[PDB]
């Protein structure tokens, strides 16, 4: 039930994103 | 039931994002 | 029931975000 | 029932955010 | 149940994206 | 010596827009 | 020697906008 | 020798905007 | 030798804005 | 040799704004 | 071995760029 | 081995950039 | 092995940038 | 092994930047 | 192993920055 409605700017990440 | 409606700027992260 | 309506600026984090 | 309506600036954190 | 409705700008990542 | 530039850059998600007039979002 | 630049950069999420007039968000 | 720049950068989430006039958010 | 810059940077969340006039938030 | 800069940086949460005039928050 | 990325994204308006070099926007 | 990223994002208005180098915006 | 990120985001207005180097905004 | 992040965000107005170096804003 | 973050956020107005170095704002 993970919902992301807003804008995301520069999500630097090391682990797998899986969105 | 995780909902993110706002803007997120530069979310640097080490673990998996999963959003 | 986690809801985030406001803007978030530079959320540096080590553990998994899961938003 | 965790609701965050205000802006958050530089939330440095070590544990998982989960917002 | 991973849903991403918002725009994502520059998601630099090391692990597999899988979106 | 004027210019005119419009940049309506929309990034957020919009749920159920019930507009009837002119929109340029 | 004037200019005119409009930058309506929208990033937040909008729920149920019930506008009827002209909007440039 | 004037300029004119508008930067309406919106980041917050808006719930139920019931506007009828002109908005540039 | 004047300038004019407008920076309406909105970050907070707005619940139920019932405006009818012109808004630039 | 004047300038003019407006920085209306809003960070707080606003509940039920019932404005009818011009607002630039 | 080597992994170099040079991503350049632009959204804002650019008025009268006087350039001789490689501005790479 | 090596992982270098140079991301440049721009949203604001740029007026009259006088450049000779690589401004990389 | 090495993980270097150089993210540059800009939202504000820039008026008359006189540059010779790599301002990387 | 190494994880270096250089994030630069700007929201305010910059008037007449006279630069020779890498101001990286 | 190593986790270094250099976040620079700016909201205020900057007037006439005379710089030779890397002011990194």
From Swiss-Prot, chains A, B, C, D, E:
The modification Tyrosine amide is found at residue 19. Transmembrane segments: none annotated. The keyword Disulfide bond applies. GO terms for biological process: amylin receptor 1 signaling pathway; amylin receptor 2 signaling pathway; amylin receptor 3 signaling pathway; amylin receptor signaling pathway; apoptotic process; bone resorption; cell-cell signaling; eating behavior. Keywords: Amidation, Amyloid, Cleavage on pair of basic residues, Disulfide bond, Hormone, Secreted, Signal. GO terms for molecular function: amyloid-beta binding; hormone activity; identical protein binding; lipid binding; receptor ligand activity; signaling receptor binding. Amyloid fibrils are degraded by insulin-degrading enzyme IDE. It is found in: Secreted. GO terms for cellular component: extracellular region; extracellular space; neuronal cell body. Can form homodimers. Interacts with IDE and INS. Interaction with INS inhibits homodimerization and fibril formation. Amylin/IAPP is a glucoregulatory peptide hormone that plays an important role in the regulation of energy homeostasis. Selectively inhibits insulin-stimulated glucose utilization and glycogen deposition in muscle, while not affecting adipocyte glucose metabolism. IAPP function is mediated by the CALCR-RAMPs (AMYRs) receptor complexes. Amylin can also bind CALCR receptor in the absence of RAMPs, although it is more selective for AMYRs. The mature protein is largely unstructured in the absence of a cognate ligand, and has a strong tendency to form fibrillar aggregates. Homodimerization may be the first step of amyloid formation. Belongs to the calcitonin family. IAPP is the peptide subunit of amyloid found in pancreatic islets of type 2 diabetic patients and in insulinomas. This is Islet amyloid polypeptide. It comes from Homo sapiens (Human). The lineage of its organism: Eukaryota, Metazoa, Chordata, Craniata, Vertebrata. The chain holds residues 52 to 70 of 89 of the full protein.
């Amino acid at each position: 039930s993970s919902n992301n409605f807003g804008a995301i700017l520069s999500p630097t990440n090391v682990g797998s994103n899986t969105y």
